[PDB]
């Protein structure tokens, strides 16, 4: 029993974290084999950041301008390269602690673990979701750039996020490990609109199914609904549409509790139209959309 915000163990990622200094700028790098991946904005001065030409700035750099540190050991840089918005630094030593890994690109509504680091050292691990508007609500401070998001599938680490910037809203933007930003965002100090967010319907439902398993069932009703009937309510309240794929995905939790997916859509319909009526679900007066059906099934079965 119990249902909690839960991260992957951070060990295999901890072993990959290093400190990258270009001139006056220090942030975090990921060390896999003999390549260190970090945000390319590490080569920008304060000035540069208003209007960076990354091509000209990197042409002007030498392998010596990059200082890489694994603990207090210097890793000699022997090559430097850009792929989209990530800098790749070739070092002379393969990371012995390199695990089995992949670079994956995630969608809105998918959760991942963040290991927030400063100066190549780990501070903590937390869980979050890619928002519908391709940002994340992280906990980041100065020098946290290059911290990474990941899932662990058996022994294999799937790196899905590298932290690049905080927007005026105080929410977070970054890239996959191929340097392609999530969302319209750019590694330029400009005006950049977070872009109105929405709620993750399939996740809220996952959370309701969790609620049920942990004995919290007051919001269950006899009403029912069609998918098109659900989504018409959804759009009104800035919830994302629900698709037969989302329905399918919820299949096992439904099997687990015997509560038909569309019956849960009837519970949720009611909560959106009437409110919780002074109530709480797992203690919250709010509906929780950053747990996936996967995350719920993992913890509650």
What does the buried/exposed string (b/e) look like for 111-121 if buried means 16 or more CB atoms within 10 Å of the residue's CB?
bbbbbbbbebe
CB 148 within 8 A of CB 158: no
Residues 6+ apart with CB under 8 A from 155: 99, 100
Tokens of 20: 């990258």
First to last CA, the chain: 9
145 a catalytic residue? yes
CA distance 290 to 273: 21
Residues 6+ apart with CB under 8 A from 199: 237, 238, 239, 240, 287, 289
Of the residues 38, 145, 160, 300, only one is catalytic, namely 145
Q: Which is nearest to 74 in space by CA: 98, 99, 91, 62?
A: 91
Q: For the purposes of burial, counting CB atoms within 10 Å of the CB of 286, is it exposed (0-12), middle (13-18) or buried (19 or more)?
A: exposed
Annotated resolution, angstroms: 1.9
Domain 201-300 grouped into CATH 1.10.1840.10: yes
CB 122 within 8 A of CB 17: yes
Angle between helices 227-236 and 261-274 (to 10 degrees): 30
This entry's atomic model was obtained through: X-ray
CATH numeric code, 11-91: 2.40.10.10
Residues 6+ apart with CB under 8 A from 106: 112, 130, 160, 161
CA distance 113 to 44: 28
Of the residues 41, 80, 164, 246, only one is catalytic, namely 41
Give yes or no on whether 11-91 and 201-300 have one common fold.
Answer: no
Tokens of 169: 């809203």
CA distance 300 to 158: 23
């Amino acid at each position: 029993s119990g249902f909690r915000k839960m991260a992957f163990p951070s060990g295999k990622v901890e072993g990959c974290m290093v400190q990258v200094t270009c001139g006056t700028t220090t942030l975090n790098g990921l060390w896999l084999d003999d390549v260190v991946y970090c945000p390319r904005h590490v080569i920008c001065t304060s000035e540069d950041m208003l209007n960076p030409n990354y091509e000209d700035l990197l042409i002007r750099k030498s392998n010596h301008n990059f200082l890489v540190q694994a603990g207090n050991v210097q890793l000699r840089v022997i090559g430097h390269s850009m792929q989209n918005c990530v800098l790749k630094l070739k070092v002379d030593t393969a990371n012995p602690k390199t695990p089995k890994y992949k670079f994956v690109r995630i969608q809105p509504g998918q959760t991942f673990s963040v290991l927030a680091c400063y100066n190549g050292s780990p501070s903590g691990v937390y869980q979050c979701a890619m928002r519908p508007n391709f940002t994340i609500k992280g906990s980041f401070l100065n020098g946290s750039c290059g911290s990474v998001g990941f899932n662990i599938d058996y022994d294999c680490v799937s790196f899905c996020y590298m932290h690049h910037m905080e927007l005026p809203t105080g929410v977070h933007a970054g890239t996959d490990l191929e340097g392609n930003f999530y969302g319209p965002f750019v590694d330029r100090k400009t005006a950049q609109a977070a872009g109105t967010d929405t709620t993750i319907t399939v996740n809220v439902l996952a959370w309701l199914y969790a609620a049920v398993i942990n004995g919290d069932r007051w919001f269950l009703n006899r009403f029912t609904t069609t998918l098109n009937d659900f989504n018409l309510v959804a759009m009104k309240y800035n919830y994302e549409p629900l698709t037969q794929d989302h329905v399918d995905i919820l299949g096992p939790l439904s099997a687990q509790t015997g509560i038909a997916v569309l019956d849960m859509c009837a519970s949720l319909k009611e909560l959106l139209q009437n409110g919780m009526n002074g109530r709480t679900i797992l203690g919250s007066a709010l509906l929780e959309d950053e747990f996936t059906p996967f995350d719920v099934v993992r913890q509650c079965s």
